Paper text:
Vibrio α-hemolysins (αHLs) are β-pore-forming toxins secreted by Vibrio pathogens, crucial for the facilitation of bacterial infections through host cell lysis. Here, we investigate Vibrio campbellii αHL (VcαHL), and establish that its hemolytic activity is significantly stimulated by calcium ions, with an EC50 that aligns with physiological calcium concentrations. Using X-ray crystallography and cryo-electron microscopy, we decipher both the immature and assembled structures of VcαHL and elucidate the conformational changes corresponding to toxin assembly.
To further explore the mechanism of calcium-mediated stimulation of VcαHL, we determined the crystal structure of pro-VcαHL. Paralleling the structure of pro-VCC, this structure also shows four distinct domains: a pro domain, a cytolysin domain, a β-trefoil lectin domain, and a β-prism lectin domain. However, the β-prism lectin domain of pro-VcαHL is situated at a distinct position, forming a unique conformation. In pro-VcαHL, the β-prism lectin domain primarily interacts with the β-trefoil lectin domain, contrasting with its binding to the pre-stem loop in the pro-VCC structure. In addition, the pre-stem loop in pro-VcαHL interacts with the β-trefoil lectin and cytolysin domains through several polar interactions. Two lysine residues, K300 and K302, interact with the β-trefoil lectin domain through side-chain associations with T534 and E529, respectively. In pro-VcαHL, H137 forms a hydrogen bond with a sulfate ion that binds to R313 of the pre-stem loop, while E185 participates in interactions with Q311 on the pre-stem loop. This sulfate ion forms a hydrogen bond network with water molecules, connecting E95 of pro domain and N183 of cytolysin domain in pro-VcαHL.
Numbering used by the authors: 0 to 110, 133 to 713
Write the structure that this text describes.
């Protein structure tokens, strides 16, 4: 929905864009008239990542402080991060959202199992000719005019940001922290273009406009280099503190190293350590290492780490090798007739002017009970330094010579590009839980959804909609992802209630069923088969179904693998999906064998052969129950396609106490690997690995 006209500045941005066909414009003032005017997370990801559009958000229409805060809060809640800028461009970078906040149209004129929120922030600061203009002379600065000492100078950087939670896990003395984590990185796999000052260093020669005997008489001003590059990380309040950084110690000159900066987080665990999957309560069960790769080639520069306080850290690439104009001289004395450039610019590494790509890793922590918000500020700068050298004449009696000198008091100019983003500590990703939904199984595609007034309804499932996602916490409460202060309460199931210690807010799954029970009363969660309204029931009846299905959602990070459908038994069989994009299966009363190639089937020898086409599959449903021969057993897999067609392998006829698990494939995702558990008779479980 577009309701308001574009601002004058937005019209300039749209018209000046290099690819205007890929533009998508949104005036944030529209949200006051229509809550659905803003794109949902699914729509924004589809536009930005799948369709490769450039989405422009416009906050410039109304400058009211109350309105500014409301629109920013809506943006922050929906997309995970907030900015205090009039405009925000959103584009795709490394499969994630890249935010480019800016103020003026001139700034953009081209002429696994760990739950975490990932995005990128880009800064692009062209440096004007005036900003690299210095006097042509230092000895005679008022006489020789001025010139630009750089050419097409530019700062272009991309910051990787991760919002995540670490739980405490591990042996005493080596346990992971229990803290909310904001991680900011400039790494090898997502870096921007870097900082550029010049393709090659030129110079200009000048002489004294007066006769000289014992005086400076000649000067050379060389194109500028970076005396330093600096990167400062700050916060708006003390809710966050620096926990870990790389660099940790100062780096020396001529340092060549690719550093793996690993950070250990405690997690609720994947399918390997948590058998119950989506039905598992929040509990630390494993630790994972999240690594960022940082390549250093410091050459002329040492890297100095400075921590002003617990909230601030800075990294400065400081010139150490050939750091002075004097050090660049390759001549010391000469006869007076000699007239030549006394400087060897080959002593200046190209990292100093041609291309510099900084790398660093900053990990902030906040307490596990932190609330409110914090702004994170990054100041990236280059200290532009022109180079001046001079020649001094010496006459004694009957001989003479000149000596060469460097000047270090000459002017410098620091150009800084700043960026700031806002983090909500109440974001559900900071609970450490993997988001899940509550699907009303009597319906085909209905999930529990919370509206703005916290009322509960049944809506078409959208696994990227926060209103349909919950966190199954350590007490068995179902905490809403839209508001972590609200919980699903059996005392009143028409509206979410403030989370507390009451037993009516705690839920327990009945093993090997689709039945979710309330702790206080022992009754089961039921839903009306027509309206979807929730209630507590001691049994099913004509109007009410007691079947609830839960699965992992994609509100934080898109799931790259399904949970284990069925059960694990024996050796896991990894099978890659071939170019046919087809599954081969021998079926009967159950699934005898399953495979990706007609010859390569894992399982038993019986059953009737058939094939399943993976093209257009929207979801996969696994049916299990007590088999005619044995206990709990996977007996059927149902593939549902986007057109609505369904194909089922196996059967449900020879089973009792049937229950289902549903795995929904994300859009534009390809199945590439199958993990199949089977004995000599039947297939026991299957897990799907995806690529996005």
């Amino acid at each position: 929905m577009n309701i308001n006209e574009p601002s004058g500045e937005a019209a300039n941005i749209i018209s000046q864009a290099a690819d205007s066909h890929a533009m998508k414009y949104y005036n944030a003032a529209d949200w006051q008239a229509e809550d659905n005017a803003l794109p949902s997370l699914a729509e924004l990801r589809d536009l930005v990542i799948n369709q490769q559009k450039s989405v422009l958000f416009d906050f410039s229409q109304n400058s009211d402080a109350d309105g500014q805060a409301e629109m920013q809060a809506q943006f922050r809640k929906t997309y995970g991060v907030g900015f205090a800028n009039q405009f925000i461009f959103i584009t795709e970078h490394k499969g994630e959202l890249l935010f480019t906040p800016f103020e003026h149209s001139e700034e953009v004129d081209p002429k696994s199992t760990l739950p975490h929120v990932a995005f990128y922030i880009s800064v692009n600061r062209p440096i004007s000719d005036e900003e690299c203009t210095f006097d042509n002379s230092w000895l005679w600065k008022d006489e020789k005019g001025s010139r630009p000492f750089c050419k097409d100078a530019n700062i272009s950087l991309i910051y990787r940001v991760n919002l995540e939670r670490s739980l405490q896990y591990g042996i005493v003395g080596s346990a992971t922290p229990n803290a909310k984590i904001v991680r900011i990185s400039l790494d090898d796999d997502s870096s921007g273009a870097g900082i550029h000052l010049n393709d090659q260093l030129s110079y200009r020669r000048f002489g004294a406009s007066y006769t000289t005997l014992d005086a400076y008489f000649r000067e050379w001003s060389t194109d500028a280099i970076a005396q330093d590059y600096r990167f400062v990380f700050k916060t708006s309040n003390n809710k966050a503190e620096i926990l870990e950084t790389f660099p940790i110690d100062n780096l020396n000159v001529k340092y060549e190293k690719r550093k793996q900066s690993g950070f250990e987080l405690g997690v609720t665990g994947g399918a390997e350590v948590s058998e119950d999957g989506p039905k598992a309560k929040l509990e630390a069960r494993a630790s994972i290492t999240q690594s960022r790769w940082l390549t250093y080639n410091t050459q002329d520069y040492r890297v100095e780490r400075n921590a002003k306080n617990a909230q601030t850290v800075s990294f400065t690439w400081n010139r150490q090798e050939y750091a002075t104009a004097e050090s660049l001289l390759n001549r010391s004395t000469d006869a007076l007739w000699v007239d030549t450039y006394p400087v060897d610019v080959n002593r200046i590494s190209p990292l100093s002017y041609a291309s510099f790509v900084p790398k660093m890793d900053v990990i902030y922590k906040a307490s596990d009970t932190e609330t409110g918000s914090t702004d994170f500020i990054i100041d990236s700068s280059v200290n532009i330094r022109p180079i001046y050298n001079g020649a001094y004449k010496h006459y004694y009696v009957v001989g003479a010579h000149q000596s060469y000198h460097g000047f270090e008091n000459s002017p410098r100019r620091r150009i800084t590009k700043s960026a700031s983003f806002t983090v909500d500590w109440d974001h559900p990703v900071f609970t450490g839980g993997r988001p899940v939904n509550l699907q009303l199984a009597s319906f085909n595609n209905r999930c529990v959804q919370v509206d703005a007034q916290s009322r509960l309804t049944a809506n078409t499932c959208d696994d990227q909609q926060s209103a349909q996602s919950f966190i199954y916490d350590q007490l068995g409460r179902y905490v809403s992802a839209s508001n972590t202060e609200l919980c699903l309460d059996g005392a009143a199931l028409d509206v979410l209630q403030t989370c507390n210690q009451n037993l009516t807010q705690r839920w327990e799954w009945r093993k090997n069923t689709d039945e979710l029970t309330n702790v206080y009363s022992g009754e089961s969660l039921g839903h009306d088969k027509q309206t979807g309204e929730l209630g507590l029931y001691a049994s099913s009846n004509d109007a009410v179904s007691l079947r609830t299905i839960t699965a992992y959602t994609n509100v934080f990070n898109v799931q790259k693998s399904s949970p284990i459908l069925g059960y694990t038994q024996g050796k896991m069989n990894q099978q890659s999906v071939g170019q046919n994009y087809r599954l081969y299966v021998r079926e009967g009363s159950a699934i005898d064998a399953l495979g990706t190639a007609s010859d390569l089937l894992v399982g038993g020898n019986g059953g009737s052969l058939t094939s399943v086409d993976l093209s257009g599959v929207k979801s996969i449903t696994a049916t299990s129950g007590d088999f005619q021969y044995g206990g709990q057993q996977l007996v059927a897999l149902t593939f549902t396609y986007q057109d609505g067609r369904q194909q089922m392998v196996g059967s449900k006829a020879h089973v009792t106490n049937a229950h289902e698990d549903r795995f929904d494939l994300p859009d534009a995702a390809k199945i590439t690997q199958l993990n199949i558990w089977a004995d000599d008779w039947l297939v026991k479980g299957v897990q799907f690995d995806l690529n996005l």
